[PDB]
Chain A
């Protein structure tokens, strides 16, 4: 059954951008998807999106550029110290010059670069480049 809702989302907008779609419906919705997307938006990877409120879990409709090469989930949500976060961006991003690991800290769901300057580790959610 559906277990990692953030997996369904990121794979669906990855599939869609590979196909060259201008926007994509992602048809379950969680607050964790919405925080992840806002992080991808702040770095300009995806376009300004839209959360459709039915009275169940939402549906989101995500405007896409051709900037997002790949977004993806790391399942399971492994715990990451500030020590380990080099070895993740070492093996999980395509360079040091770009790409962002999203990881849910206590401070909030955010990129690896802000998790450095805030000096807070946490659980790796995914990554995008």
Chain B
């Protein structure tokens, strides 16, 4: 069951049993990391990196090929973003909605969906403060939000 919907969807990605790398994949773990760096430098998220990789370069899971996963490869060298991509995207969506709702006070549905998105943010913020990957001093305020692109 979804967080802020009645939806009981089951559209999950389903990894195979065999964590063992396939045969055909000729790229060594280092050249995969080198290509991950090349994608990160272009300005892509670990989500967008992983998609571009498995599509055009036949690398199912970076964790399967290498040891580690894409953010931890970004983070080790310091190509990772300061605030997480998923909490970035909710703040990005909240600034989009709030801009729409500046000149559309009639749009009561928007206003309700804003409160649902605000709740997704506060909920993730609270999680990342327990894991100290955000400052304890940090708090998403909608007036301070437009600077956080």
Contacts and interface: CB of A to CB of B under 8 A. Distances in A.
Interface of A: 54-55
Give the interface size class of chain B: under 10
Interface in B89-129: none
Contacts of A55: 15, 17, 19
Interface string B19-43: 1000000000000000000000000
Chain B interface secondary structure, helix, strand, loop or mixed?
loop
Contacts of B15: 55
A55 B64 CA distance: 13
Contacts, number: 4
Contacts of B17: 54-55
A55 B61 CA distance: 15
A120 to B, nearest CB: 37
Contacts of B19: 55
4 contacts: A54-B17, A55-B15, A55-B17, A55-B19
A54 B19 CA distance: 11
Nearest to B19: A55
Nearest to A53: B17
